[PDB]
Amino acid sequence: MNTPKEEFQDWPIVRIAAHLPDLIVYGHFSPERPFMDYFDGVLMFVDISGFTAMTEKFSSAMYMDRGAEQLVEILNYHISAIVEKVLIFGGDILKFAGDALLALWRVERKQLKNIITVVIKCSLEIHGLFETQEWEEGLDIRVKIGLAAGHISMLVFGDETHSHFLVIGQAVDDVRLAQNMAQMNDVILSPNCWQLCDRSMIEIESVPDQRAVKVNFLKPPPNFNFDEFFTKCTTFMHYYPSGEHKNLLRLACTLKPDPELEMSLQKYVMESILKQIDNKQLQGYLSELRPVTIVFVNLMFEDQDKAEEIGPAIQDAYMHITSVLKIFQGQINKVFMFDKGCSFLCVFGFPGEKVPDELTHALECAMDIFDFCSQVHKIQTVSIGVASGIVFCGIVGHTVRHEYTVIGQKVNLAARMMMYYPGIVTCDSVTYNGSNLPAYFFKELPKKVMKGVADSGPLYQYWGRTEK
């Protein structure tokens, strides 16, 4: 009696699970929005910001008309190898957002110490991927790694058809700060990660004027076997692929059709991604160098680590942001913490979502969002950065773990505008000149040197219709 091999694993539910972490896939949580969870873990923040420079050169006539295709191919080539490293070492990739990825090892407090060792070793094997890596003309493209450990809160917000999630708290703030201290090839530990770590495993040096530390070496004791050590650590990793599924990168590759789970998971994913997953759109349609308008929205709180305080406020802002964006096919691409505030990366003019008068609409939407969010209880400061131009749109990461992302100088510009000009609506020259709006709607701003952007162009505050 025959026994045919290889289980079918290309279900729509599996394709949707690629765009999500295990934190979501295996989350099983209540309907209420906002939803909040509290746990401990180790965070890894890998920065690959050599490619926001690569985006510009891929726009040139060199690449003929295959710049977006060549860019996503070389990106994913490198990011796939980082993803595979994180996954094999037992991490959950939470999020991709142009310039970086965030990974989680969610673990009970007693196991934090040993898991930090696992995460450090993973970090050093990531750097070793790029030791003699390059693309000939210009540079060599390497990574920067910040690590943190401690209390982590999760926020889930949304409505009946859309869901978004965020990690929040001191370890989230710390991993971002650790990453900003890092140079090319560094592994930085947050002060608390250093306080919790196995100090007899790791050789560090002092970071100037900083409580955070730099890993120089992993020097394991005489009788230490990393493979045996890792095997002991997998005891505490709920979803580590094992036994008959030991060949898999993600347990999520084994998800079976489940209408109720799929209904809940599809809400995290953009309708155009779902269409491609459903084989109703060509799988290359979403990789594009495309003119868009970025509306970057930042919401500041008195304490950005207390999810019970800020979760209701983000939900309230989300509900209004979503109603305003739908009007013009605006999309929330990502939500995440900056080093100060919760930020919504909103996009006008994504593939098949182009409206006429994109710029006038992006500006009126920004002001609407600004005015509402300014009246939301616990929102201390709203800042909105508006920038317009050619950006890269595409699915970034590994086959088993990928996300739709925007990358480009105009993405970085909108982000830097909202941090360097807090409390106002700002826009670039493209938005200002190409707005179908009169000059007195705007105030021409002083020029600030912005860490990441070279000649921004003239910047403007969107003042709005009246003097008041």
What residues form the annotated binding site for ATP?
Answer: 47-52, 99, 144, 406, 412-416
User: Cα–Cα distance between 111 and 132 in angstroms, integer?
Assistant: 34
For the chain, how many residues are written?
468
Stretch that binds ligand BZ2, among 81-89, 98-106, 356-364, 388-396 (CB under 6 A): 98-106
Q: Between helices 307-326 and 358-373, what is the axis angle to 10°?
A: 150
Residue 118 within binding range of Cl ion, rule CB under 5 A: no
Q: C-beta of 20: minimal distance to Cl ion in Å?
A: 12
- Residue 34 preceded by cis peptide, ω within 30: yes
Our separate counts of H helices and E strands in the chain read: 14, 16
Q: Is 41 in contact with 175 (CB distance < 8 Å)?
A: no
Beta bridge partners of 177: none
Residue 178 within binding range of ligand BZ2, rule CB under 6 A: no
Q: Which of 99, 358, 403, 428 binds ligand BZ2 (CB under 6 A)?
A: 99
Q: C-beta of 234: minimal distance to ligand BZ2 in Å?
A: 25
Q: Which of 18, 68, 102, 149 binds ligand BZ2 (CB under 6 A)?
A: 102
Q: 143: which residues sit within 8 A by CB, 6+ positions away?
A: 46, 47, 48, 82, 126, 127, 130, 184, 185
Residue 167 within binding range of Cl ion, rule CB under 5 A: yes
Q: C-beta of 73: minimal distance to Cl ion in Å?
A: 27
Q: Which of 101, 115, 317, 424 binds ligand BZ2 (CB under 6 A)?
A: 101
Residue 336 within binding range of ligand BZ2, rule CB under 6 A: yes
Stretch that binds ligand BZ2, among 15-23, 96-104, 134-142, 219-227 (CB under 6 A): 96-104
Residue 97 within binding range of ligand BZ2, rule CB under 6 A: yes
Span 147-166, contacts to Cl ion by CB under 5 A: 166
Q: C-beta of 31: minimal distance to ligand BZ2 in Å?
A: 25
User: Cα–Cα distance between 116 and 421 in angstroms, integer?
Assistant: 37
Residue 58 within binding range of Cl ion, rule CB under 5 A: no
| Stretch 332-351: interaction string toward Cl ion, x if CB under 5 A | ----x---------------
User: Cα–Cα distance between 183 and 157 in angstroms, integer?
Assistant: 35
Q: Is 154 in contact with 24 (CB distance < 8 Å)?
A: no
Place of tokens 């993405």: 411
The conformation of residue 449, written as its DSSP 8-state character, comes to: P
For ligand BZ2, give the closer residue by CB, 255 or 295: 295
For Cl ion, give the closer residue by CB, 166 or 390: 166
User: Cα–Cα distance between 430 and 444 in angstroms, integer?
Assistant: 13
Annotated binding site: 47-52, 95, 99, 144, 167, 176, 337, 406, 412-416
Q: Is 280 exposed, middle or buried (0-12, 13-18, 19+ CB in 10 A)?
A: exposed
Residue 51 within binding range of ligand BZ2, rule CB under 6 A: no
Q: C-beta of 169: minimal distance to ligand BZ2 in Å?
A: 13
Count Cβ atoms below 10 Å from residue 255 Cβ, excluding itself. Answer: 21
Q: Under the rule (CB under 5 A), what is the footprint of Cl ion? A: 95, 166-167, 336
Q: Under the rule (CB under 6 A), what is the footprint of ligand BZ2? A: 95, 97, 99-102, 336, 338
